[PDB]
Symmetry: C3
Subunit: 183 residues, 3 copies
């Protein structure tokens, strides 16, 4: 019911300019606004699909030759948005699931399918290094629920050859727990 | 009326040693002291030109084959120094200006010219990744003042082919403001 | 009397899974658990040698083709462990010593020899960028003690061609001290 918009620029100044322009252009939330090596800039927005399409249209329209890439992912479960900008609260501890993908697009699509095909909580979506790099989702819930979520997410990414690894970790060790659910 | 000294080493231990040596050698402020990938070390100093020349002389004199590069930038407006080490306080909000350059030297020279050719506040000078990488200056003030500052800075960097992008952003959006003026 | 175990994986999810598995497998402390560019994962453990051998055995046994590298360093002075995970308290200020190496293995072995061949405090062991990159140890104590420690450490690393630089810094400047002993 929500949408994610991604805009990547070769200029950090243009990135900040376009972040400003897009936020003014439509009712959208800023999820990510950061510099990526070597010196590119990444913006990710969340909001209604109409708003996101117009925001990304505005951004692409004004990027010129500084435009690197852009994407709109429609019909994304609402919990995915705060999982990109930060952390969702864990309401169950029994198990953690982690699915690692190439690309944040594959990760987002897999996380969406996971949440929609199970009763797990999507805790966070992490990008190790920009939108083309290793990304991973972390889910939490009952072991059976986590297994379902991880399977669905893995199938999503794997169909594309973009699954790196999947892991179901019941009863995570106390010394790993914080890193898993908070980073 | 002030000067900036830059010393880059291939050794982190030598960098810390030379930071110590230079600070003892003259009355200078440490502005930056950090490791840069792959494993080099960056020192930037501020102070009177005489002190900075002797500090950088000392540093270069003792660097040996670990010396990567060194520079002294003379007659730099005093506000540029704290803009490199941290943030200057914003006394006006009406507009933000951002000028992105290749190299911190070009950024410093452009920021100096901007401050000297306008009434803007130089808020900060940011290096994304070491002294040769993308850098940018952020200024704040009245829209007309910011436009002047950005034009002057852009001309400085552009004459060298080192201007990446320039942006005048009146009335920055609330969700971009903090990143612009604080990073 | 203690041991350090190192496990490196090509998968971040596998890394977190293996961190969990190894911690459950034996009585070991997690010293490091982090992602390294481009997208690998690094685990370092401390504990009794028996526990560490079994933990690393477990980790290697389950890593499969995601295994990048693994190492067990036996008979490491106990102070080296907290120097890897964080900071040891400085009980003397007179001098700082810094020895920079290629590889954390060389750094650990050099730090161990330094501590065992002197009365210095090992303050910290730092990895700039993963286990193969620039690393350095920082020691503190009386100038004579620091000189001994640095010489011993330098000989250790230098015999292998893995010494980058060694530095004895009596009476470190106030503006460098915190970075030296805390990072
Ligand atoms: Cl559940
Ligand atoms: Cl102004
Ligand atoms: Cl001592
Ligand atoms: Na649990
Ligand atoms: Na404003
Ligand atoms: Na001292």
């Amino acid at each position: 019911s929500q949408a994610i918009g991604i805009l990547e620029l070769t200029s950090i100044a243009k990135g900040m300019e376009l972040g400003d322009a897009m936020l003014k252009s439509a009712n959208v939330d800023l999820l990510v606004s950061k510099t990526i090596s070597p010196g590119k800039f990444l913006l990710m927005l969340g909001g209604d699909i109409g708003a996101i399409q117009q925001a990304i249209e505005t951004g692409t329209s004004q990027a010129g030759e500084m435009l690197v890439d852009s994407l709109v992912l429609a019909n994304i479960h609402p919990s995915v948005l705060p999982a990109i900008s930060g952390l969702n609260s864990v309401d169950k501890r029994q198990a953690v699931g982690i699915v690692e993908t190439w690309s944040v697009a594959a990760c987002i699509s897999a996380a969406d399918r996971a949440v929609k095909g199970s009763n797990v909580t999507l805790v966070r979506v992490h990008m190790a290094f920009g939108i083309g790099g290793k990304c991973y989702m972390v889910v939490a819930g009952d072991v059976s629920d986590v297994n379902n979520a991880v399977t669905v997410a893995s199938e999503s990414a794997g169909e594309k050859g973009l699954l790196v690894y999947r892991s179901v970790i019941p009863r995570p060790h106390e010394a790993m727990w914080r890193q898993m659910v908070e980073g």
